[PDB]
Amino acid sequence: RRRRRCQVAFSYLPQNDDELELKVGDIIEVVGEVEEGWWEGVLNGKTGMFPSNFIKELSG
């Protein structure tokens, strides 16, 4: 089981009790997609939902 990591590009505070707080530069272990625009992941031990359009694209 190898890792699937991504990097937060923009901060985000939760609007529902299942959501993660995102801080710029945070590295999330991705679980999967739940809905358009919404992924589940693990960040600092907590599993929760986060907006996928707040994640940094890899462009070199």
Binding site: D18, V34, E35, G37, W38, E40, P51, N53, F54
Partner: peptide, 11 residues
């Protein structure tokens, strides 16, 4: 700032 999409689905 980006805009989050609407949500309906949860675990």
């Amino acid at each position: 700032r980006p805009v989050p999409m609407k949500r309906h689905i949860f675990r």
